Structure formats: structure tokens, C-alpha cells
Amino acid sequence: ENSNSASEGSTINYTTINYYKDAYAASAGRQDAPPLKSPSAEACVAQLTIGNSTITTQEAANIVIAYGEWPEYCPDTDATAVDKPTRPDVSVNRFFTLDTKSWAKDSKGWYWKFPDVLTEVGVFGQNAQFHYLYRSGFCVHVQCNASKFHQGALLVAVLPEYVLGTIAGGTGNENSHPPYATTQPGQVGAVLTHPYVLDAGIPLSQLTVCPHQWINLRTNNCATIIVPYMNTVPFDSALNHCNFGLLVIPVVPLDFNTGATSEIPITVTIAPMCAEFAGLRQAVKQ
Amino acid sequence: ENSNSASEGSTINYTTINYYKDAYAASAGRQDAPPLKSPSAEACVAQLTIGNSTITTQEAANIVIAYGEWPEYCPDTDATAVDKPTRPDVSVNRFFTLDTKSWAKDSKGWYWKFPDVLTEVGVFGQNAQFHYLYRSGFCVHVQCNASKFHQGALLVAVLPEYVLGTIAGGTGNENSHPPYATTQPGQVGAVLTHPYVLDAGIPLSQLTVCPHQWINLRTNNCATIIVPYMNTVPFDSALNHCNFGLLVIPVVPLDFNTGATSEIPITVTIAPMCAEFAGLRQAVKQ
Amino acid sequence: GIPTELKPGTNQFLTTDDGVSAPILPGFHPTPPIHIPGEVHNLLEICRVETILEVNNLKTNETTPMQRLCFPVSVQSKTGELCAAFRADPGRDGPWQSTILGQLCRYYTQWSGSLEVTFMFAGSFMATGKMLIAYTPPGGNVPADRITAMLGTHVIWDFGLQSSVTLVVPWISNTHYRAHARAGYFDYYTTGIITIWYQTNYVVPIGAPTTAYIVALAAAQDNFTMKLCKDTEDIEQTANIQ
Amino acid sequence: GIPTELKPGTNQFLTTDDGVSAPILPGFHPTPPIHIPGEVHNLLEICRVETILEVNNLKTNETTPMQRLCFPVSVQSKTGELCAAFRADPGRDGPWQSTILGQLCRYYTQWSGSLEVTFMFAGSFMATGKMLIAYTPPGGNVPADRITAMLGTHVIWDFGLQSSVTLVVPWISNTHYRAHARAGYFDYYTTGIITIWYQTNYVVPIGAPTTAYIVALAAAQDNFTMKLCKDTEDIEQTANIQ
Amino acid sequence: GIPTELKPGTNQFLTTDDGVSAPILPGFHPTPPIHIPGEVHNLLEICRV
Amino acid sequence: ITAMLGTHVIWDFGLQSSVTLVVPWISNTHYRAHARAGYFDYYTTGII
Amino acid sequence: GDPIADMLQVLPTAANTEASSDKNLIETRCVLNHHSTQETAIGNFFSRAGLVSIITMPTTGTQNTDGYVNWDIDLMGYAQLRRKCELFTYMRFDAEFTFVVAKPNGELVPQLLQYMYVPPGAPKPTSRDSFAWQTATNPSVFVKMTDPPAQVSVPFMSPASAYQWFYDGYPTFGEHLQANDLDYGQCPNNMMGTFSIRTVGTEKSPHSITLRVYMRIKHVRAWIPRPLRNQPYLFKTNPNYKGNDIKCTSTSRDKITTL
Amino acid sequence: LLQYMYVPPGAPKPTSRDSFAWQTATNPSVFVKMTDPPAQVSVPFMSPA
Amino acid sequence: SDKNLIETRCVLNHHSTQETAIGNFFSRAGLVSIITMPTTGTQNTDGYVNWDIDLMGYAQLRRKCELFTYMRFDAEFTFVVAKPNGELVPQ
Ligand SMILES: CCCCCCCCCCCCCCCCCC(=O)O
Ligand SMILES: CCCCCCCCCCCCCCCCCC(=O)O
Ligand SMILES: [Cl-]
Ligand SMILES: [Cl-]
Ligand SMILES: [Cl-]
Ligand SMILES: [Cl-]
Ligand SMILES: [K+]
């Protein structure tokens, strides 16, 4: 028998029936913190230092490790491109802070795409443009300060392969598509027009099935999520493909009494982790 | 089960399924220098002497052994005719030089057929005519001298079973056939009318998939290819069947400045190797 | 040939039949798999992840759906008030429909096990108070008042001291499994009712909002399972998908 | 007889089905095989043999096809000139189509591995010079100039000193396999671009031609494989073959 | 394929035939049985009452 | 967005009243003469 | 020596309850719970054949009236199977395709048919008589409409390690001007080519033919759960939704205090 | 040609010969011809009790 | 040879070569003949036909075979018969 079944190479063993020389012709048969509940760093004044930069959190049980997996360089068993990759390390795996957003009582919510956010920032950006192939994980840190008299709750989540959709002309008759500035808004991010369906026909209420953390003003002022590289290929174009989107949505609206500070910003600070590149040539912006 | 499968007698073992007494009724099943890249004599002033003749080359890494197999007499396991063959040796396995061709700036290319080239030459010719059955290998040596100021490149290749075709009347409506003088031109060889398709509807660009050597004027002045006997039968008629064709085609045209010698010849010298004959009777020319 | 007799079932195509079929590509080998984070093996892994419950599923906020994701709590002038109520049936129309637990439940006919409802208070740090959260097993309707609701399974939550609390809805049923409850004979399978009452009051000092919101999430516990796989009512097709 | 049930697939004739069939000649034994030079077992053996690339595949030389088998190099008056460019996709329309590697690639849907392009200078012994041969991974179009092309994978060749040089096009891809690239979505699978530039110049003394030609050949390396056998686009049948 | 010959009886549906049939629900497990008083195994138990 | 490309620390003064920024020795020479306008600006440490 | 110093989640049965998380907030008894978790294994959830295509070859009309059809393989045209698959971001599997063919009213006639798998890059049939039907390399199935439904196994064929229902990007480099936004979200690694069907004859068949294709996912692996579709599907290749009628995920009621 | 589909409690019922429910992506269905032998399947013990 | 002209990493490549084994390349049934016995016309209208076995009339299988000079094999012949429009009758 040829070992060409789709399940060949998995830890689970199935008992199947077959009458042909190819394994995939066989019957499906029968088989014979949790990765999905946003595992905290512990389950798997504080200071996270990476490169020449340091942010300050409070607890390791407050850092989510997406899918329970820490970022890593691509192993030889999964690699396919044969050139030696460049792993610049400290010049690219460090914290970059993007433009700050302003949280208002009627804000809808925002999203950023990765690695799009940094393709034009620092040495990371340069490497992303000079190489065809890119790969990395990310430490995502969202910051929001308010007083003990303010209230509100942001859901901060990482949605892998965040494909956006349109309102189809309102009536649903128009097969319109999101424009480039909407699918890859860059460093400044973009605003959601229908946060309830994440501008993609899926419920915000179930977004917690993805790696996430809440920023509930009365309890915390920051959220930190560590994201491993996720894709169906070991390396990919940092320009053509965004591996995941970061969503920051006010599920419980911001509120405070008149006279309390009304300028409440939200700041995103991100650090590539284990960034590596391959397929060197001239710089390409898109 | 009867061992009558077509693959019976090969080194490869296949795992097949069968429900009948005859092995050939079974399913195809599954299985369970490089011979094709023109292996040099080493991979498997110099002087090659055979019989009463000697040619002079330079390196053994410059001699191609077609399909990595040296010529040999037919083994008893493959023989079928029962009479004792005659192996005249030195009178037939020696170098014969044919009429020289003249390479011009616009030459199309030439071909010779084996053993047709020598059926009327020397003791080899006589044996080929007196016997029904013939068999042998060949050492093919192509020579071309030019100065360090001349340029050009000949592709010298051996194409087994070189069946020629016609232009089908130009329009493709006429089922015409190559005449005898074209299919077996004898010692003088023949000229290609459409070298790009080898006068047989197949690309000259892929001819290097056959045993070959380049004669690039700036680097070498000769090509040597050793060819083993190739056929679906152990012996055959030297008159009715040509086992292979020798092709010499100027892929990069000859060039030189006015005043440099313009008479640049190409000479073919060939030696039968392990020639043997059987089925003796009167001399037959064709 | 070997003597055989064709039996009933012959030639039929049963969509769930797990058989063998002739492979169209001999000797074909697939692209090897590479490691990818997030592999799941059993839908229960997803059912145990909390997702938001639309407790505030009002007809009046269908056009501002975001408001369905949290419900209000505020300074009361009369004590023992009911803040919110909803059924505890995971696969029934209502608040649970917005959870991924609820949506996966709809791909099965029956379920069993304990559930968890987590309430997250998102008012200010200066706001404090206590609520009584009760799970009333089957028998009647929404308890008419707190002194009746407290007779059932319940937890008293101080949202001043802890922002989140979890109410466990323990599996309390006559049958080992429940088909999804709905009006009519199938109400026999109802899980019961969940109510949240003011134990003390929502209290604030001068300077903080007098109304805040609570987000409720739900998930299944480790003893939860589902049975008899079926198609869901929550997706249809009325026209071509182009 | 033995109880059986016919399943879907019954009576169908699947052309790639590897089954058993009744033998028409009982007791028949074939002519034994004899040793014949040149047996091949796997098409990859052929894919590794270099064959000529039609880099000079111009519309203007279709009627003198022999001229497509080599391209010119000559004395330049301006430095850093581009001599020739072409894509590195083995199964795509263009120069690779003339190679046996290219033609066998067309009997498969996907490929993987490193390729080799050998350049043979056929000018005179008195001609010398250096060229820069580059392989530009996916990302843009033909590099606009040598100072841009040299940023990619490349080799500097002195054709005065060595008549042949081999450029290795290493497998650099996102996916483990590539379907054959072509305009449109499938350009996602393009391998990149190959360009050959003048590093110094083609130089000659008095008495030698100022223009010469280079023959380019291509083959697959040992890590090359193909997948998903299919029919080729390079042979058709519009009328009866008589 | 394996040589076979269909015999008389082929395609018939005999109501008392004790055969095997394709299961409509893969991986399905029933509600476990609980102890219930009064199980009977053979009708003779009733005939003796 | 330009300053964050250098050595830096993010301080939450709500949570901690004091923070310390370390200005690590990053110089071409092993020692610096005191920087001032002119050729001696060669010895400047940088900016905070 | 060194100059530089710096250089299983779900078990076979449901958890038991021990006598005094239930046994944390309430007093509990012991329950020896042996309820199985097998039916929720993704394999049992997915290995059920579902409709993925309806191909018609009418004898009258303005489409496919020539006895052959080239159907671009796109399995996202039917809501039920699509929503189940879209519960995940990536899925790897083999598939069993079953071909249920009949006339438009369900009647069957003695008609010979050919189904041919034309992988990307293989020449497509351009008529009922095209040379491509010679099928010397592509796999073909010849079957009669009176035979049981034809059925074959198709292996995992993507150039990538898994098919992906969501690809946030573009297939190629370049400017991405408004006129080409259809490119967004198009993953060539899921593009499996063409499925070609014809009535086997140089003369036209008098029968209108309707083919229903069912696909059964098998030997499946899935990665990254995502929120389940809560708006009606509109298009095969994108998640567009009708903006003027955004459905709430849950039904509504009058008050938050009454059922 | 006929189709028999098992629609468990709570699954959407077909409302026409063309209803989307016949897509039967999860429910078990049997497609059979009236000229075939009688269709036949095994149904397990399905009660919640 | 990559690791000769460029700097390379280690790649544990387990891509199979089985599908390019000549057996898998060739063991796929292909059309080699179309024989007609019409009831009307000027050829083979007598209910019988003697077809001289010549398998080089269809381009696809022919080109694959002609990739080689000599080939030895057993063959499975399948006979798909129908009326000219694809209908079947009890004949
Ligand atoms: C001989 C006849 C067999 C042909 C059957 C059709 C084969 C179609 C290819 C199967 C591909 C299955 C993977 C589908 C991945 C989903 C792609 C998509 O629709 O976006
Ligand atoms: C009982 C009916 C069975 C008859 C089937 C036809 C058998 C035909 C003979 C098979 C010969 C196969 C070898 C073909 C070699 C190619 C010859 C050629 O066309 O040049
Ligand atoms: Cl929109
Ligand atoms: Cl001619
Ligand atoms: Cl045909
Ligand atoms: Cl239907
Ligand atoms: K247990």
C-alpha cells in the first residue's frame, strides 16, 4: 500500500478498511491550560524586554499564549525553500509602537493586519521588502489607561486569516469587494463599519473562540497576546498575505461623568518574534 | 500461477493482485555517472588503438559511453540462433574513415546510419554481406579542426532507431515516404532538410537526451562516443535494419573573419566493436 | 465464480456509509503536512470555550445589535429587584444562540452535562454591590421574586470585589440526555431558568456612572457531550450562492 | 450464496483503476526479455538530463527555428547591459517548453525542487569576458538594471576562462510544491526571473568575430519531483491520424 | 475483480432474514442502560405465570 | 513613531511612581571627552 | 575559546462527578458518567456526504445544450457543507465524490456518460468530441445513468499543507487597484481545476441530464476554530453579507426580565 | 430516483421537492432507484432515556 | 548543488518519486480505437468489422509511448460500447 492518506503523518491512529493500493482510497474508519481557552503564560511590576525595548505589565498569568504555542523559527522538517535564511534578531525582534487611537463613547472598533502593520517600519520593514519569504510570531500589547471612575471593556483578539467582506451594496445584489486600503490599512489600522459581524458575516460574540484578552477598565489597563506563526506554508510573502488580524472592539462602551478626562487613548505596541527572511533580491513595496 | 507476466525477469519486484492462473492477468501493483547524462569513460595526448589503427584524443573524461554500457558479444542467455558465430576480431574491429564533409556558415547538418555506413567497406562489409545475422557496438569519433579565431558548435549525437519522416507534400496531405537513398545513404551520409525537427517531427533541442558530445571549436576538436549494441533481438540483418543514426548538427553556426581558413572539414572515423556474424550463406548486397 | 446472493441495500447510496472507493490517482503522494498551531480533534474542545450570550436580546435593539452583547445594572430605589432572566437551554432559541456552544449544539439532537455562565461586570472600579444569581431547576416559570429564587441553586456575587463570577448550571435532569427543549412536548427537556437579582444594591460615590453593564459568557464543562449528529436550523439557502 | 450488497461505484469503468482482468490466453508464455541498454524506471531520470532552452524564442525567427537554439553576446559600447531575460517556470509557455524537462513537467500538475541552467559560450578561443547571471526570486518584474539584479541569487561567469557555467536556481518557494504558473491567480506559483548581464564586456583581438552565441540548457537537480499526473497541453488532435 | 456468480434469492427481501445493514450514524453511542426491575428474556417466563 | 525605534522603556506611572531608564554605554570610542558644539560633538551620547 | 559570548483534550467519555466544577459551587453526589465523546470527533462530524454541485445538461435552452460541461471545481455553493467547513480556518482531507445522475424529474434512461478530472493546466474539452476525451492521462469514469451512482476517492491535492477557507491576501504582487479587488481572498492552493462531463457520443443525446455531486470528507484534520457564519451566504468566493438586513444571531423577546 | 432522509428532532424539514434541506450535509440520506432492491439501513437506539 | 553556489539551510525533503515511476505514468487507460458499425451508409453496414490492431491513431497515448524507443508490457483492454448518441439497447 502507498502511504498517501491525508491523515498520514498525524499523531492519531485510525482503523480503516481498504481494497486498493493507495491509502487515501480507504474508509474514514474510527480513532483507535487548553489551547483554545487562551492559555496564560503561567498555565503553559513585570517587565518584558526584547531587543532594545521594554514594556511593563504585571503578571505572567495575564499574558495569553495563542493556541498554547510559543513562536519558533521554522524547523528543518517543515522548511521547503533551500537558501539559508537571514535571522537579524535584535534589529527586528523588538517593540514597535503604532499611531494611537482615540476611544470615544460611540467608537465602533478597530483592526490591524499582520505583518502589514510593520512592512514600512524599521529594519523589520526593510527585510520584509527585500525578501520574497518572511515568517515570524508576534508579541501584541494593547494599552489603555483610564481612572477608577471610568468604565468600559475592550475585547482584544487575534483572528488568523481575517478575510473582510462588504455589505454587498446594502441590498446584497452587488458583488463588491473590500479595496486595498481596507484589507491592508497599514500601521494606522482601520475602523469596523459593522463590528457585530466583524465586517465579515461572522459573530463578534464568538470571537472569544480566538486568542484574546479583555481590557476591563476597572481591573486592567493592558492586554498582551503572544502569537505563533500560523499558515499552510512554512514561509510566505509579508506583502501579499496577512497571517492574522488584531481586533480591538469596545463590547461595553466607554463611559464616565462630565469633567473626568475624556481623552482616553488606545495604543498598540507589537514585537516580531523569531522573524526570519529568505529569497533575497531588490526591495519590493507591494 | 503461470509466470507469464511481461515484467517477469526484471530486477524490480512489484506487489500485485491476481484471481487467475496467468500472471499477466494481475494488476500493475506498486514497486516494492547516470546512464542518460552521457557517462564519460572515467565516470564509468591520449591514444585509442584498435586493430591496426590508432586515433589520438586527450582525455578519458572526454569519451562518452552510451547508456553507461560497453560493447560486448551476445551472451548465451540472450542468444537464440544456434550456429557458432564468427568473431573475426582485428579485421573488422578497427577504425574506418569515411568521406569528409565540408562545414559551411550555412550548413544544415548531417546524419549517417549504422551499420549501413560500412556494409560495403573492408572485411566488415564482406562479413555483413555473407551473413544473415550481424551484431556489434561502435566507437564513433568525429573530428573537426579550426583556429583559435574560428567559432562554432556541433552537437554530435547517437539516436537509436532513427526513423526518418517526410514533409508530407508540404501541405501534410501527401503520405509520402523517405526513399531508400535517404534512409540508408551509405558511407557518404546525408544532409538534413529540417534539422530543427531532425527530419522526423521531434525537437533537435531534446537530442541531448541521447548519447552525445559537443564539439565547441574554442574548447575541443573531436568527439568520441562508444555505443553498445541496442535492439529488441540479439542479432539482426546489417542490411535491412540500422540500429542507430549518428547526427552532427551545427547548433551554433560556423563563423570566422574573412581571410581565416574557410575550408573547415568534419571527418567521421568509426570502429565496429565486438562484431559477430551468423547464418552464413552467399554474399547479399541488399 | 463464488456463489453470492445480493441483499436489500444493494445499489443504494447512503451518505453516511463509510466505505472504500477506487482511488483516481495511482502512486500519488500529497504535500506533507507541516506543523500548524491550533489543531482541534473534537468539537467538545470548542464547546468548552466561553463565548458571549445575548441576554439582552430585545426586539428593540435588533438594528443596533452590539447592544445585545451586554446588559445593564444600576442604582435601585426598591430592593430585591430582578435584573435579568433567561432559560438555561443551550440549544434553544434565545440568548444561547449567540454562543458557539449553542451553535454547535444545533448540529446534534441531544446533549448532556453541566454548563457554566460567567458574568463580567464592566462598571467602574468605584462601583460596588452584590447580586444573587440563581439556577432554578424545572418545575415552574421565572421565580416571581428573590425570596423564591433563592430556594434554588445559586451563588451570591460581590462585583465590587471580583469583576467576574461563574455560575455553574449543574446537570440536573431526569433523563441522561436532553433533546433540545422548545414549546410543546419537548418542554419536557427544559433545563430550567437563570435569574440574576440585586442582593444589596449597585452603589457608587459622587463622580461615577449610575448605570453600568455586565457581559455574560457561556461554555460547557468537561462532563458535557452531544449525541446524534444532525443538520442545523441556523443556516439556510433560499437562492443561489453566486 | 454468500450475502453481499452492491455499493456505489458498481459497474463503473474508472480508467486509472488498477484491477485484475481475465487473461485471454491460458498457458501463454512471452518471448523472454533480453538485455537492452538504456532502460529507464522513473521519468525523473530524464528530467535530470539537460536539453536546450529556446531563450531566443522570437516571433521573428519562427520560420528559421534553428536560430532559437542559441542567443547572441557581442562587444558592448555601454556598460552593464542586459543580454537576455526569461522566467524560471519549468512548465510555463516560453523558453522552457523546448526542454524535455519542460515537456515532462506538462504531464504533471505540480513540481518541486532546484533547477539548473547551464550556459555554453560558443564564441572563439580568443574572445573573453564576464557575465553576471542572476536568479531573482518572486516579487517584481525583470530587474531594471544590473545593480538591481545583483541583489539576488547570482553567479559571475568568465567565459574566457570557462566555456560553460551552471546557474543553480535553488528551490525558494512559500509552498512545498508549485502548480504551473501562468497569468492570473496562478502567478502565485511563479519561480522568479533569470537575467544575464555583461559584468565586464565581450572582448576580442583583431581577427575574431565581434558577435558570438551562447547555448542555454536546463535540467532538474536530484531534489526535484513532480506530482498529480495529467494530460499535456502540448499535443492535440484536430483530425484523423491516417 | 473476484469471480462471483449471483444465486437464486438475489435481491429478495425476506422479513426474517438476520443480516447486517449499513449504520446511518457513524460514531453514535446510545444512552447507557440503567437497571430496571422486571426484565424478561424468554416468553416462557410469562407462560408460567 | 520615530523615537520608538531606539532604546526605550514604556512606563505606567499609574502603577509605579518611579521608573528608571538605563542609558547603556553605546559609543565608538572606549571613552568620551565631554561633548560640545564643534568637533567634540563627535563624543555626544545621544538624546533622551 | 569563544571570542564573543553573546553568540488529548477530549477523552473517550464525559468527566465523572465526584461526591462533595459543580462539586465546587453546589454539593454533589458521585456519578459514574460513561457518555461517549466519539460522535463529536471531527471525523464523524465531517464524514457525511453533502451536496456540493448540481450540473445540468439540458437539450433545450441557452446553456450547456451541446452534451458536455466543464465545471470549475468550487465547493462553496451550498450552505450546509460550507458552514460546517468554515467552522475552521484550515482543513486537510481526502474526499469521496459520488455522482447521482438522472433526468430533471428523477427518471433514469440507458445513457452512457463520461466524467473526467481535468487538473489545472490540462486541456479542457471544447466539444462533445474533443480530443481531450481520449483521456490517456487524466482519470475518467464511464458510467451509465442506470448504474448505481459512480464513486471515487480523491486524495489531498493542494500544493499547500491544507486547504484554507480563509486567505487574507492577494495571489500576486502588484498595484491592487479597485478594478481588480476580485483578487482579494483568492487562494490558488484551493484551485483544483475542472470537472468535465459529457454524454458519450458524436451524435446528440435526446435526454436532458442533471448531475448531483456529493462529497464526503475523510481522513480529516482541522485547525483554528472561528465564529460560525451568522448571515446568509451571497457569493462563493467571499464572505460578503447583505448590509441592509444584518441578522441578529439570537431570536428576540420583549423584555430582558420575562421569557 | 428517490431520496429518503432522516430528519432528527430539531433539524429543518424539507418544505418542497427542492428545499435546501435535501443538501443533507449532516443528516443521513439514502438515494435509491425504485428498480433497485429495497433500501435498507440500521438505526441505533436513539432515545434520551 | 544549491549548497555549492548559494548558502543553504537543511531541508528534510520527503517528497515522493513514486508518481513518476513509468508504471504510474503509463497504467492509465487511454483511447486507442473507435470502431463503428452503422446500419446505414457505405461502410461496415453488415453487422461485423475486422479491425486491424494498430494503436497509433490517437495522439495522447501515442506521444506518451513515443517518449521511449522500446516498451514491453501486458495490456488491459476495455470495450465501451453504445449507440452513436450514447444510448444503450439490449444487443
Ligand atoms: C474521474 C472523476 C473524478 C473527478 C471528481 C472531481 C474532483 C474535484 C477535485 C477535488 C478537490 C477537493 C478539494 C476541494 C477544496 C475546496 C476548493 C474550493 O472550492 O475553494
Ligand atoms: C477477446 C477480445 C480481446 C481482443 C483485444 C484486442 C487484442 C489486440 C492485441 C493487443 C496487442 C497489444 C500490443 C500493441 C503493440 C502496438 C502495435 C502497433 O500499433 O504498432
Ligand atoms: Cl463594506
Ligand atoms: Cl522530406
Ligand atoms: Cl471519444
Ligand atoms: Cl438537491
Ligand atoms: K469518565
Author numbering:
A (entry chain B), B (entry chain B): 14 to 45, 65 to 76, 82 to 323
C (entry chain C), D (entry chain C): 1 to 242
E (entry chain C): 1 to 49
F (entry chain C): 147 to 194
G (entry chain A): 1 to 7, 23 to 35, 59 to 297
H (entry chain A): 150 to 198
I (entry chain A): 59 to 149
List sentences quoted exactly from the publication behind this structure.
Enterovirus 71 (EV71) and coxsackievirus A16 (CVA16) are subgroup A human enteroviruses (HEVA), small, nonenveloped single-stranded RNA (ssRNA) viruses whose protective capsid mediates cell entry and humoral immune responses. The external portion of the icosahedral capsid comprises 60 copies of viral proteins VP1, -2, and -3 arranged with pseudo T=3 symmetry, while their N-terminal extensions and 60 copies of VP4 line the interior, surrounding the RNA genome. There is a “canyon” (a depression encircling the 5-fold axes) on the surface of enteroviruses that often harbors the receptor binding site, and there is a fatty acid binding site below the canyon base, within the hydrophobic β-barrel core of VP1. Here, we remedy this with high resolution X-ray structures of both mature and natural empty CVA16 particles and also of empty recombinant viruslike particles of CVA16 produced in insect cells, a potential vaccine antigen.
VLPs were secreted from Sf9 insect cells infected with recombinant baculovirus containing the P1 and 3CD genes of CVA16 (09-7 strain) and purified by ultracentrifugation. Crystals of CVA16 VLPs diffracted to 2.5 Å. The space group of CVA16 VLP crystals is P4232, with unit cell dimensions of: a = b = c = 347 Å. The recombinant CVA16 capsid is self-assembled from VP0, VP1, and VP3. This particle is unexpanded and in the native antigenic state, and thus, the external surface of the VLP is structurally indistinguishable from the mature virus and natural empty particles (RMSD in Cα atoms of 0.4 Å and 0.3 Å, respectively). As expected, the residues lining the inner surface of the particle show more disorder; indeed, they seem a little more disordered than those of the natural empty particle. Disordered residues include residues 8 to 23 and 36 to 61 of VP1 and residues 1 to 13, 46 to 64, and 77 to 81 of VP0. Residues 65 to 76 of VP0, which include the cleavage site between 69 and 70 (cleavage of which produces VP4 and VP2) are well defined in the density. The pocket factor binding site located inside the β-barrel of VP1 is fully occupied by a fatty acid acquired from the Sf9 insect cells, which differs somewhat from that derived from mammalian cells and is modeled as stearic acid. Compared to the head group in CVA16 mature and empty particles, the smaller carboxyl head group of the stearic acid is positioned about 3 Å lower than the hydroxyl oxygen of the sphingosine and forms a hydrogen bond to the main chain nitrogen of Leu113, similar to the carbonyl oxygen of the sphingosine.
